Design a protein around this ligand. Structure first.
Ligand SMILES: *[C@@H]1CC(=O)N(c2ccccc2)C1=O
Length: 352
């Protein structure tokens, strides 16, 4: 004869510590769903949708933390009715943390821009954070996570992006335990595209900064780099913020302004290429040295003409490579020196 309806929920009655990273759902068997309601302690209805066939019902909005939810469902069929009531307690985070993703949604960036996810708290379970971040690419390319510090994680392929590539980032950290009770405050989703290949190279042996667009030299800039005592580091740099004019306070980098190697002046047409202070800026006071000798604290001294041209034609994510200098190699965890870490080490990751 007719069979008694059966109900199924994605939560268990009496569950404590239920994660809010997924929807709560009720499914019916041997019948249809006649009524479903979910409420918090205070009694406010939690939004939900029922499938046209009446078999599946799921929550249509996020669920809060430290909540006591009550789910009431009724199934009807030819073989009778069934009513269930459930109550579960959602997660109680010891602390929350909001993610911050760059580059911004819709941007077009150079072939060296890595996907960056920054949290405003230290992350204790890095693997949980890597698992909660989805990275889609078209054309699909291999990539890998690597942490610069306890709070920011990066993702890039082995070699520079092939132009025209779409990148989609889905940081689905809400409802996910990130260690020691650290849960996500919200989710984020950005998308960006890779633009022209723009690789600029600065050779200390020639003291010249050459900008190449799509493999073709388009500009040759005489420059003066870091002097022997405060030299520019060799390696690959990624282009960051661009300023029509920027006040260079030495204290920003921990070096006191009232010091031999300190400084507090205002320069024009500055393109940041290092968190540690390396720039490409306008330096009128060194035109004579530019192209011959080094007389700076680390940034590439360029004429106002060329500096502005650099400002106008170089976008976030383009590459600046420095070679044959007397200084060392840019640290891989600088924040813009990601490509200076060997691919094997980067791929391996440091999730611990
Ligand atoms: C790199 C960092 C900075 O701000 N620099 C500087 C510009 C003008 C005068 C003194 C120092 C650099 O060389």
């Amino acid at each position: 004869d007719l069979l008694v309806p059966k109900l199924t929920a994605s939560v268990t009655d009496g569950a404590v510590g239920v994660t809010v990273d997924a929807p709560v759902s009720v499914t019916a068997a041997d019948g249809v769903l006649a009524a479903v309601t979910m409420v918090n302690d205070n009694g406010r209805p939690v939004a939900g949708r029922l499938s046209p066939d009446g078999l599946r019902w799921s929550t249509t909005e996020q669920l809060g933390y430290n909540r006591r939810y009550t789910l009431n469902a009724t199934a009807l069929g030819l073989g009778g009715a069934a009513t269930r009531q459930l109550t579960f307690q959602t997660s109680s985070p010891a602390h929350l943390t909001m993610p911050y993703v760059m580059p911004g949604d819709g941007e077009v960036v150079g072939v060296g821009e890595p996907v960056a996810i920054r949290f405003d708290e230290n992350i204790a379970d890095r693997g949980a954070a890597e698992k909660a971040i989805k990275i889609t690419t078209n054309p699909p390319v291999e990539g890998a996570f690597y942490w610069l510090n306890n709070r920011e994680v990066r993702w890039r392929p082995e070699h520079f992006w092939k132009p025209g590539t779409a990148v989609d980032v889905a940081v689905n950290t809400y409802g996910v335990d990130l260690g020691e009770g650290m849960f996500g405050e919200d989710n984020v989703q950005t998308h960006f595209t890779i633009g022209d290949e723009v690789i600029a190279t600065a050779d200390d042996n020639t003291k010249i900064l050459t900008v190449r667009v799509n493999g073709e030299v388009v500009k040759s800039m005489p420059t003066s780099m870091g002097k022997d005592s405060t030299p520019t580091a060799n390696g690959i740099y990624i282009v960051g913020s661009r300023y029509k004019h920027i006040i260079m306070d030495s204290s920003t980098y921990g070096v006191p302004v009232n010091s031999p190697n300190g400084y507090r002046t205002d320069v024009d047409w500055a393109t940041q290429i290092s968190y540690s202070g390396v720039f490409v800026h306008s330096a009128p006071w060194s035109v004579g040295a530019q192209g011959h000798t080094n007389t700076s604290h680390g940034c590439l001294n360029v004429s106002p003409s060329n500096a502005q041209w650099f400002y106008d034609h170089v976008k976030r994510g383009d590459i600046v490579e420095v070679v044959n200098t007397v200084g060392g190699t840019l640290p891989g965890i600088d924040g813009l020196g990601d490509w200076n870490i060997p691919w094997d080490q980067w791929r391996a990751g440091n999730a611990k």
